[PDB]
Homo-oligomer: 151 residues x 6
């Protein structure tokens, strides 16, 4: 498949509320790239404290979202859409690099994650790309994550 909805994400990613930051996948190409997004709404708990009266989606959380997008890409390229295998996996961050934040993200925004694979061996995946709102680069970052069996 090339497009996945929230019920499909829940069967692949280990993340859960309040750390599942990818609402839908709009594009996917094995071992290559992925385009996904997360809607930003005031009705999110993080806004309670970031910041009071000035809702700003955290920058670290944008990185997380891109990372989670990559994870999806990594997992499905590996075993395809196999919920049963995905059931017992988790994803560790290994390294984060070269992130610039250019525009603040706020409620009402559609935070689009654009990720490409820079390199990958076995379970280690090096991804890089951007976060975009209304077609403008709101953030850029590259990260290396690791798919690991829960034990």
């Amino acid at each position: 498949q090339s497009q996945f909805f929230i019920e499909h994400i829940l069967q692949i990613l280990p993340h859960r509320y309040p750390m599942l930051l990818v609402d839908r996948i709009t594009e996917l190409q094995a071992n290559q790239k992925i385009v996904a997004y997360k809607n930003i709404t005031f009705n999110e708990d993080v806004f309670n404290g970031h910041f009071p009266n000035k809702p700003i989606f955290p920058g670290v959380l944008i990185v997380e979202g891109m990372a989670q997008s990559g994870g999806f890409l990594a997992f499905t390229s590996l075993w395809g859409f196999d919920p049963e295998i995905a059931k017992t996996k988790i994803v560790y961050f290994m390294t984060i690099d070269k992130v610039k934040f250019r525009i603040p993200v706020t409620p009402g925004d559609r935070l689009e994650y654009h990720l490409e694979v820079l390199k990958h061996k076995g379970m280690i995946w090096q991804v890089g790309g951007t976060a975009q709102v209304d077609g403008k680069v709101v953030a850029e970052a590259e990260l290396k994550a690791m798919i690991a069996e829960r034990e």
Copy 2:
């Protein structure tokens, strides 16, 4: 006068997390109509129980967002964007009729509120319209509120 953001929505509506269901206002015509929206993300608490493994934004909360939109419309018609006066008024919602649900709303949907003034007689405003997602009508509703002095 037309485009209001979450910062402005916070200054007019008393609603706060997790009951403020309007992230942005794309346009409003005094005494006529309003178009606004709320992003629907999985990272909202309500999805924890509605329902496990099948996130579906609660039908009643669509009506609430709609009511919220009409309320911002009625208020702004009377005094415009005025936070000081807003702190002194309340909009009791008296009735709701003819609400119909056609399509479930899910994480990743841009829930758009379309409300128009149906009858403005005194302190009583009556609005109606639809909630839309991607051009389609996902819900309909009629509503009647009353403008009153806060206490």
Copy 3:
């Protein structure tokens, strides 16, 4: 039966925190009616924003509670207390009508749900009734929901 506790409701309704708005079933007549309620306390997250310094249970949630009650009836009427079958379904709102909010509900209130089946066929159930607090009616509503897999 006719009396059900949270322990039972959990096994029938698919809802869970913070959207299971029925705490106990007091009276239940297959395909006819049901009386249940949800206790209202300040210790609910909803009150953080509805509203600050002035806690008021959302009107729309009172309808939700009425619907949930309707669904518990709709379901038991057709399969009795069947936790296994119950978990192979979910109930969803089709239409809401003639709702009125006469009295604001607040922490300390025992929001009682009174629903009777107006019409029902297959998974399609039409119910209507009131929401009550200490005898007085605080809300009225008619709603139609459907039970699906």
Copy 4:
């Protein structure tokens, strides 16, 4: 007054969500007794973890509710309904004794607090009593509180 509702409690107790455990006060006799209650509903965050699929209101939290009631009783016995002064004081427990849990408190329950004044000298208060559900004792405890300066 002898009957106070949540808005009143809110002006007297500093406690707030999710630690304000008293919804209403039905009887208040200065320097003597107070009777209040807290509604228990499945819709409370505590039930998520106490316990999964077996909702049971924490015994220690019952005590806390008895104590907050005592605190209200203590303060109002002294300054009456004086919101400005309450804002400057705070009640701390010093001791808790003879706590006995008899019946589990569950959703749908109306946890009624019956607290009476055992001893009161200045800012130091001793109160015994019980938490009741439908006229049956579900818990009992004694505690000595202190009225201190918020600063």
Copy 5:
């Protein structure tokens, strides 16, 4: 003798936001236990206890001593056995001689020191203190009964 959060999760039925024991540092069957809970501002409870002045609730300090004691009593009889842990429930009958001396705030490491005072059958009575930086912030005694869950 040293159990981390995961082990605790297999023994205690408590979950967020009511599992108030982060780690067991030492344990001795029928004798004592020392465990602790970290206190951080990042806890929901502080939103209301109290606004502008974070003070970990004293009743919750007691709840943590209870869970520690409950853990002590369970593992003393059955050791680290998650399976039998699901068939038994440890609830508390009485709590007595509770005393608060110092307030616990964010940044503190709330250490639980519980002793087995007496035990006969499934009735276990434990007591001890709550400590931070080697000082006593609280003390209490509790009587628990171990029963069949399901």
Copy 6:
């Protein structure tokens, strides 16, 4: 010497559940800062990160380090001035050279160690590590910007 949670509240705009620094144990203007945050199971973030396997988000470690530098930034600029503080916010500009070596879990005392690399006006570039029991759990570099809440 030591700044506690209520001091932190008076300088940092961050609040629950995004205020991830519990205490400042060391501070030296225009040079370095050592602070920490307790990690407990009783934090909402652990419900989804990850179920049955609590791991403090690596990204939140960086956020904790960023806030630490934030406090070093406010103070180095205007000292302990709560009045000026209440008017600003902090924006993330860049993050770089981050590496996670050890997983942080409930029970850990997450210590932040940051030093100033370069600063001008409201723009600050800091770097350092996050430690647990004297071991480097993670390292990173970041540049943030303090701004008027205009």
